[PDB]
Amino acid sequence: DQPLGELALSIPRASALFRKYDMDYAAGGKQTLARAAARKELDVEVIEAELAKLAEQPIEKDWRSAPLAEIIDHIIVRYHDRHREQLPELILQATKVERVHADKPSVPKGLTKYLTMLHEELSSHMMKEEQILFPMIKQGMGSQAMGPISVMESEHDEAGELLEVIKHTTNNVTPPPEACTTWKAMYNGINELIDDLMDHISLENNVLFPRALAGE
Amino acid sequence: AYRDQPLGELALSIPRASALFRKYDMDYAAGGKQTLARAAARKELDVEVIEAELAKLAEQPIEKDWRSAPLAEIIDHIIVRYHDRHREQLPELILQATKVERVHADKPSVPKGLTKYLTMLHEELSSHMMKEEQILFPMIKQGMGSQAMGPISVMESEHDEAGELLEVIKHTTNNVTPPPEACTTWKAMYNGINELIDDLMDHISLENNVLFPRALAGE
Ligand SMILES: [Mn+2]
Ligand SMILES: [Mn+2]
Ligand SMILES: [Mn+2]
Ligand SMILES: [Mn+2]
Ligand SMILES: [O]
Ligand SMILES: [O]
Structure with missing residues (x-):
């Protein structure tokens, strides 16, 4: 396989x-x-x-062989910027849901805390990528970046752990029958965040990082 | 259907x-x-x-249909088949969970917190079964089951708390599924945990769905 x-x-x-x-x-x-x-x-x-x-039709955009500099610029605008815009919104929505539906049993209590931990750690993480690792790759020094790459991959693992908790606190992001509009829409946004963040980490761990280390 | x-x-x-x-x-x-x-x-x-x-x-009939059995035989069966077994099995599971949480502390899949939750279940279940054996079961055997709405609702509420703990125990253990790296002690403990859950749900089912409603109906 x-x-x-x-x-x-x-x-x-x-x-x-x-x-x-x-x-x-x-x-x-x-x-x-x-x-x-x-x-x-x-x-x-x-x-x-x-x-x-x-696989009936080819992929919309094959990043596997694309220039590393374009991969970087794509990650910044398509994933980093989107993460920065979504997470503050989800934090506020979760606040409203945990207060308004506090008395209900299926309410995802603790979601705001976990979303907030993800926002703080992901922001610092992306700031480090955009200010240290990505520039170093753009200068052609990726072959000497095992250290920084392993630190980012470790932080990728932490983020994945938080994603697993978030998925538990929300019953795998499945709204119960009692879900209002705010509640359902929040879970839709949460699923969008998880989809983007896994594709984001996937592109970094499986294309950008190994190709940079190999000298491309 | x-x-x-x-x-x-x-x-x-x-x-x-x-x-x-x-x-x-x-x-x-x-x-x-x-x-x-x-x-x-x-x-x-x-x-x-x-x-x-x-x-x-359903091609085969139930081996023992308790739905129509005398309430006194349901009670005596509960005590021997479930209460006495819960008392023997939870102490063993508590100690096994203790050994597993220590020996496999360094592994990722270790069911951290299992001993605490098993202990809470044992404490609440012990007092629960004593209150049934000393208060509710005698009154039903005396023919006063129709006047037991209060005690039964207290037992049913406690059944709900127990179910809450069972759901916690199941999550802590990946729905009682050992990881690939599970030893013998770890695998056998999860087998015992599944046996406990199986028994306790049949136990609670027999009470909520047969003993309690039939007693309240005056049988
Ligand atoms: Mn990134
Ligand atoms: Mn990253
Ligand atoms: Mn009982
Ligand atoms: Mn009971
Ligand atoms: O990232
Ligand atoms: O019980």
Whole structure:
């Protein structure tokens, strides 16, 4: 089988399939499609059949072979800037939901705290990438960046841990029947954030970082 | 159609239907009044397949139908089959969880907090069963079950708290699924935990869905 990261970046809409299977293609892009079943000891034939047909048409944009400088500029505008705009909004929405629906049992109590931890750590994380690691790659020094890259990958792991908690506090971002408009819309935004953040980390761990280290 | 019957009645009439609902995480014990239809819709599950699985299991009658048994025999059965077993099994699980949380402290999948939650369950369950054995079960055996709305509602409320802890224990243990690196002690403990959950849900089911309502109805 091929690596998770290789398939997610080469087959359109394979990203969401892996996310709903609890398959870590971002920080666990190391993982091959085979061992992914080991976690759940579940069918691989279905996943290969789905993937084979999902690949009817080429990918909208193959970043695997794109210049590293363009990958960087793409990450800044498509993921970093979006994260900075979304998380302050989600924090406020979670505040409103945890107060307005405090008396209900299905309310995701603690979501604001966990979203806030993610915002603080992700902001610092992205500031470090944009001010230290990305410039160093643009100057052609990626081959000497094991240290900084390993620090970012460690922080990627931390963020993934927080994502798992957030997914638990919200029953895998599934609104209960009591969900109002604010509540449902917040969960939609939360799913959007998780989708973007896994594709974001995936692109970094599975393309930008290894290619930089290899001297591209 | 089975989908229109209450969970509790299905569990009490179809052999091993209890295990099918535990596989689907359907609460037939404290939520046995809930119909299979509403329970399956709540979890976005194909109810027609569940009905086929039930019809298969229902090819065979229940080995022992407690729904029509004398209340005194239900009580004596509960005490020996569930209460006495819970008392022997929780102390063993507490010590095993202690050994596992120490020995495998350095591993990621270790069920941190399992000993605390097992202990809370044991404490609340112990006092719960004593209050049943000393207060509620005697009054039902005396023919006063129709005057036991109060005590039964207190027992049912405590059944709900117990279910809350069971849900905590299940999350701490990845739904009682050992990781690949699980040793023998770790695997055997999770087996015991599943046995406890199985028994306690059949235990609570028998009380909420048979003993309590029939006692209140004057049987
Ligand atoms: Mn980044
Ligand atoms: Mn990053
Ligand atoms: Mn009891
Ligand atoms: Mn009881
Ligand atoms: O990032
Ligand atoms: O019980």
